[PDB]
Amino acid sequence: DLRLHLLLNTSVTCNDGSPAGYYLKESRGSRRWLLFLEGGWYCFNRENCDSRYDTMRRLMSSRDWPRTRTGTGILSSQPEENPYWWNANMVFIPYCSSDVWSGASSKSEKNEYAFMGALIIQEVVRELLGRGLSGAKVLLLAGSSAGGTGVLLNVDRVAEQLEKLGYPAIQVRGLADSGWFLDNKQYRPTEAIRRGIRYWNGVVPERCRRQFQEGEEWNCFFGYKVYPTLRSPVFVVQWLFDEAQLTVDNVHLVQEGLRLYIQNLGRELRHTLKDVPASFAPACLSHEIIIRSHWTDVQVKGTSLPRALHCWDRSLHTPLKGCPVHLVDSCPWPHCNPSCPT
Ligand SMILES: c1cnc(Oc2ccc(-c3cc[nH]n3)cc2)nc1
Ligand SMILES: *[C@@H]1O[C@H](CO)[C@@H](O)[C@H](O)[C@H]1NC(C)=O
């Protein structure tokens, strides 16, 4: 089990002003550290944040958090469940800022809610350095859904923070699961991100900000636009027919028009990954994520995700015999890969 620690700096807060925190399980015999960002949508104005506070309050407050959590999937310490990193130091960072991990605004007279996602990550890292992170050889910043987009937005800032604090030997890397979206034509919403950024005082990586310039920072929330600006190694996991992508596209499951739409979506996603050397993109319709216990079962071209991640580790010690890292399905319809989740 992972044990809860509330941040000692109580000014780094969840939406309602309660302190943020992290769940930790240490592994004294390991110099690998996995920091996982939880997901779960976002809110972008007073009225829809108020509704989220009524029925999704654990994503806005630490008041009701439990003292422990069980690590599952990539956060499991059992080798049978986690062939990749079972002996690592494990950290789960709850998502209580509703800002896709981008915010840097405190609660005040003018702000009913605090949006501090980017500052929560920085403060967790700072407090972990005194609990053993100072001895790490690799820090893998991972996350699912809104946490996957959060990895893309924050991995280079973690790397810069550690260099400025005096820890240049720690290698910072990212693993972005289910957070790579397309600003495509709907079958029958980027405005919500644009409004959110202003409401949150959201921050994006500096090289991406300098490309798109003032008022266009929403572009940096889209993986295919922000990824080429990043310096840290990043592995991308994305279903070709992700259920959240289809939901925002107003697709709910077929005649010819919808068949062509779905096939084109898969081709567009595959195209955006052509120049991403470390990636795992199966041809499945799914909302499943990498902290589920059966994450080992899906394969692309005969290779599982735990294997691909191990091959990525080896590559960061040119392509490796029998150990691939670029795994993108080419078949054009959901479940054309037989290993897709049920
Ligand atoms: C399932 C899927 N997604 C979420 O949260 C997100 C929602 C939208 C974005 C996003 C990024 C660029 N444009 N929209 C990112 C994360 N939560 C559950
Ligand atoms: C707590 O965090 C805030 C925001 O990063 C920072 O401004 C402040 O200096 C911190 N307090 C202490 C005592 O370090």
Side-chain angles (χ1 to χ4, degrees), residues 31-33 85 133 136-141 155 158-159 162-163 167-174 232-233 313 316-317:
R31 298 201 188 259
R32 300 176 199 211
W33 284 76
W85 267 27
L133 182 62
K137 59 197 200 170
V138 181
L139 190 172
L140 181 57
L141 184 66
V155 65
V158 170
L162 290 179
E163 297 168 353
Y167 298 98
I170 304 182
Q171 296 183 58
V172 175
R173 314 172 176 169
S232 300
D313 283 10
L316 294 172
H317 291 169

Side-chain angles (χ1 to χ4, degrees), residues 131-189:
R131 291 177 155 271
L133 182 62
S134 58
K137 59 197 200 170
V138 181
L139 190 172
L140 181 57
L141 184 66
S144 296
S145 86
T149 311
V151 169
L152 301 172
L153 297 172
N154 289 277
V155 65
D156 277 9
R157 189 172 298 108
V158 170
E160 172 211 304
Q161 175 193 8
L162 290 179
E163 297 168 353
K164 293 191 174 191
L165 288 173
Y167 298 98
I170 304 182
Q171 296 183 58
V172 175
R173 314 172 176 169
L175 171 56
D177 169 30
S178 299
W180 185 275
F181 299 110
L182 303 180
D183 50 342
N184 64 342
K185 171 69 178 297
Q186 300 171 283
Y187 176 66
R188 291 195 173 103

Side-chain angles (χ1 to χ4, degrees), residues 279-301:
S279 51
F280 188 88
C284 309
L285 170 65
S286 188
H287 66 259
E288 300 264 77
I289 60 174
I290 63 177
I291 53 167
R292 81 193 186 279
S293 72
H294 288 92
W295 75 303
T296 55
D297 294 339
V298 176
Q299 293 172 14
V300 171
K301 297 169 166 72

Side-chain angles (χ1 to χ4, degrees), residues 39-42 95 100 144-147 149 178-179 181 189-190 193 218 221-223 242 244-245 248:
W41 295 96
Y42 59 89
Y95 180 41
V100 203
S144 296
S145 86
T149 311
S178 299
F181 299 110
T190 55
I193 293 296
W218 68 267
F221 282 61
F222 288 85
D242 179 273
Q245 176 81 51
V248 301

Side-chain angles (χ1 to χ4, degrees), residues 219-327:
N219 283 279
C220 299
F221 282 61
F222 288 85
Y224 76 97
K225 300 184 206 190
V226 65
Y227 173 97
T229 76
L230 302 182
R231 294 319 181 241
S232 300
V234 175
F235 193 113
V236 176
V237 177
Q238 187 70 28
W239 307 114
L240 298 180
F241 314 97
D242 179 273
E243 279 181 22
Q245 176 81 51
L246 286 170
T247 292
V248 301
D249 285 325
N250 293 319
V251 171
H252 297 293
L253 301 151
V254 177
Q255 301 196 269
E256 173 171 345
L258 183 55
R259 174 180 67 78
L260 295 175
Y261 184 91
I262 292 172
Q263 290 176 327
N264 190 62
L265 169 70
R267 288 192 309 261
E268 291 180 340
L269 200 79
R270 183 171 148 83
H271 176 77
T272 63
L273 298 172
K274 179 196 281 188
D275 298 340
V276 180
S279 51
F280 188 88
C284 309
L285 170 65
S286 188
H287 66 259
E288 300 264 77
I289 60 174
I290 63 177
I291 53 167
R292 81 193 186 279
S293 72
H294 288 92
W295 75 303
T296 55
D297 294 339
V298 176
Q299 293 172 14
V300 171
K301 297 169 166 72
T303 299
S304 71
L305 176 63
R307 178 158 182 77
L309 295 169
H310 159 68
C311 298
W312 183 49
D313 283 10
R314 282 186 60 199
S315 78
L316 294 172
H317 291 169
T318 152
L320 302 173
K321 181 171 180 165
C323 218
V325 308
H326 182 88
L327 295 159

